[PDB]
Each structure stands twice: as C-alpha cells, then as structure tokens.
Amino acid sequence: AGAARSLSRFRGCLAGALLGDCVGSFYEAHDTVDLTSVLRHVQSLEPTEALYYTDDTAMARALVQSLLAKEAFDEVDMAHRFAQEYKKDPDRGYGAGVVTVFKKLLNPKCRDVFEPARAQFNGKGSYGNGGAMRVAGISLAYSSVQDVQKFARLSAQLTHASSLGYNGAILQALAVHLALQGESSSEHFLKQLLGHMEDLEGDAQSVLDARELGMEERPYSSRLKKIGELLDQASVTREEVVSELGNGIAAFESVPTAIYCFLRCMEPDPEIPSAFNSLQRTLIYSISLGGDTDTIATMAGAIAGAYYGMDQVPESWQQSCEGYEETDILAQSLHRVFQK
Numbered sequence: 001a002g003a004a005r006s007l008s009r010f011r012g013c014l015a016g017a018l019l020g021d022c023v024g025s026f027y028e029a030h031d032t033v034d035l036t037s038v039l040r041h042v043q044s045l046e047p048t049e050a051l052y053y054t055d056d057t058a059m060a061r062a063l064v065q066s067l068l069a070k071e072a073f074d075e076v077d078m079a080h081r082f083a084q085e086y087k088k089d090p091d092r093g094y095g096a097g098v099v100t101v102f103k104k105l106l107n108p109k110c111r112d113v114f115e116p117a118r119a120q121f122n123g124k125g126s127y128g129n130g131g132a133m134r135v136a137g138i139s140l141a142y143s144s145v146q147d148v149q150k151f152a153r154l155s156a157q158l159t160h161a162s163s164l165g166y167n168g169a170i171l172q173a174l175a176v177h178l179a180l181q182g183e184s185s186s187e188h189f190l191k192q193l194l195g196h197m198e199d200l201e202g203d204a205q206s207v208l209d210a211r212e213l214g215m216e217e218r219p220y221s222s223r224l225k226k227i228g229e230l231l232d233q234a235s236v237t238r239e240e241v242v243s244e245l246g247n248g249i250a251a252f253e254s255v256p257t258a259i260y261c262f263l264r265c266m267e268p269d270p271e272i273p274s275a276f277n278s279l280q281r282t283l284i285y286s287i288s289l290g291g292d293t294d295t296i297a298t299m300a301g302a303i304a305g306a307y308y309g310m311d312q313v314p315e316s317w318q319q320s321c322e323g324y325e326e327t328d329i330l331a332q333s334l335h336r337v338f339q340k
C-alpha cells in the first residue's frame with residue numbers, strides 16, 4: 001500500500017467499500033449466517049459486474065461526486081445529489097425514513113437542506129448508519145482530524161441528525177482516516193479512536209441525546225472500550241460479537257462492529273482459510289456476522305481497503321461488482337484533487 005494516503009490506499013478504500021456492499025448484499029437481514037456458506041459463495045466470484053451495489057454505494061458515489069464537483073463541502077450540492085440519485089434509481093434499498101428526507105429535498109421550495117433530517121423521529125433525527133455507510137470519501141478528501149470530524153458530521157447530518165447517527169459517521173470516518181496512515185498496532189488504532197470519541201461525547205448535547213435513550217453517558221466510547229476487552233478475550237464467537245456490539249441498522253450497533261471486524265482480522269484466523277488475504281478475511285468475517293451485512297461489510301471494507309491497499313483487492317472479486325471502474329476512477333480523482 002506504500003506511504004500514508006497513497007493512490008493505492010485511496011483505490012483500495014473505495015474498492016473495499018464496494019466489495020463489502022456488493023458481496024454483503026446476498027446476506028442482508030439474515031439473522032444468522034453460516035461461514036461455510038459465505039466461503040462457498042465467494043468461490044462463485046473466482047474464474048462481469050454481476051453483483052448489484054445498493055444504497056450504500058449509491059450514496060457514497062454521490063458524496064464523492066459532490067466533493068469533486070466543488071473541491072469542497074457544499075451542503076446544498078451534496079443534498080441535491082443524494083436526492084437526485086434516489087429519484088433516478090429509487091430501488092437501491094433505501095429505508096422509508098431517508099426517502100421522506102429525499103422527497104423534501106426534491107421540493108425546489110426547500111431552502112434549508114438540514115431541516116428534513118432534523119424533523120425525523122419526532123424532531124430527534126435518525127440514529128441510523130446511513131451517514132456512516134457513505135462517509136469514507138470524506139477521509140479521502142480531508143487529511144486533518146479536524147476536517148474529517150467537521151465534514152463527516154455535516155455530510156452525515158444531511159440525513160442523520162441524531163448525534164447517535166452523526167457520531168457514528170465521525171467514528172467511521174476517523175477509522176478510515178487512521179487506516180490511510182498505514183501500519184499500526186490494533187491497540188494504538190483503538191486508543192486513537194477512543195480518545196477522539198471521548199472528546200466528542202463530552203459535548204452537552206451528545207450527553208442529553210444518550211440519556212434520553214437510556215444509553216451509557218458516552219455510548220461510542222463505552223463500545224470502543226468493549227472492543228478492547230473483546231480483542232483480549234479467549235474464544236470469541238461470532239454470536240458473542242453480535243451480542244456485545246450488535247449487527248443492526250443503528251450506527252451504534254454497526255460502526256463499532258465494523259471496526260472490531262477490521263481490528264480482529266489484522267491477525268490470521270484458523271477458521272478462515274489462510275489462502276484468503278487480510279482484506280478478503282475481513283470481508284468474509286464481517287459478512288458472517290449477519291444482520292446489516294451490507295453496511296457492516298461496506299464499512300469494514302473501507303477501513304481494510306485503506307489499510308491494506310489495492311494490492312489486496314483481488315481482481316476477480318473487484319470485477320464482479322457493478323460500477324467497479326467508476327468507483328476506481330472516483331478514488332483516483334479524489335487523490336489527484338485532494339492529495340496532489
């Protein structure tokens with residue numbers, strides 16, 4: 001993968017996300033998934049564009065297309081691109097909630113593009129993982145922690161106005177940010193994320209948002225702490241992971257899980273054949289958790305792809321995915337424009 005923030009890492013990041021979405025799609029909303037099944041099914045990749053992407057990729061592409069068009073974050077442009085993408089291709093797997101947001105954004109009378117998201121859930125906003133599932137491009141465009149946080153938040157808030165939603169997007173963007181920096185201990189990676197989340201969850205609004213939902217005072221911080229405990233635990237089963245971290249559509253029940261998958265799979269697992277590389281292993285492992293496989297795998301894939309780089313993206317897998325060339329072009333353009 002080479003240096004921090006290399007072309008290879010950019011390409012690997014978006015390819016990894018695409019793979020997770022396309023391959024994870026087959027198992028979406030499966031309560032349980034058998035590992036042998038995933039393996040058998042990834043054999044079906046080996047020897048074009050046979051696997052459709054979902055809303056995860058559709059929104060990721062629109063986000064990145066906005067950043068490229070403006071060479072900056074522009075809420076009006078990005079909001080419009082999200083809404084127009086839905087309009088043109090509505091059957092990509094959007095929830096009814098975010099569709100309500102899109103319909104409001106499509107009204108040419110809508111001046112304030114943040115207001116639709118805020119009206120959701122009786123004015124409290126969605127805590128879904130939709131803000132995070134598309135956020136990797138933010139970490140490609142912006143190098144500083146400060147900017148990653150600011151624009152992961154803003155991009156997320158166009159559809160997910162609950163701090164439980166947009167803080168999940170920040171966490172995912174931070175994970176990609178770190179992975180683009182290259183080789184790290186799992187301990188150092190986790191500690192860096194924990195520090196950032198502890199700082200964010202100090203905010204008074206974040207504290208109130210959690211309290212309303214009966215959650216721990218610092219939800220993501222507490223979940224990252226659990227990840228540290230899990231990584232030290234003997235004979236952790238896929239069920240115990242799901243049990244402690246979740247595999248759901250809430251950002252809190254999917255973003256930490258995706259990060260755990262990345263961290264866990266830094267090391268060889270005897271349960272996944274050693275022939276699979278580290279990226280492949282991460283994707284296989286994350287999909288085998290079940291639940292929202294598509295988003296958990298797209299997020300784990302973004303992190304892993306940034307970390308391992310394009311050399312770990314198997315051409316046979318990549319070429320099975322709808323739009324892999326467009327995805328690759330977007331990654332190279334992000335590098336040219338923002339990491340020249």
Ligand SMILES: C/C(=N\Nc1nc(=O)cc(C)[nH]1)c1ccc(N)cc1
Nearest residue numbers: 121122124125126127128162212213
């Ligand atoms: C923030 C929130 N809900 N957000 C949400 N997003 C989702 O995707 C799904 C669900 C169920 N709920 C909230 C709503 C009411 C109160 N009383 C307190 C908080």
Ligand SMILES: [Mg+2]
Nearest residue numbers: 054055056093
């Ligand atoms: Mg999807």
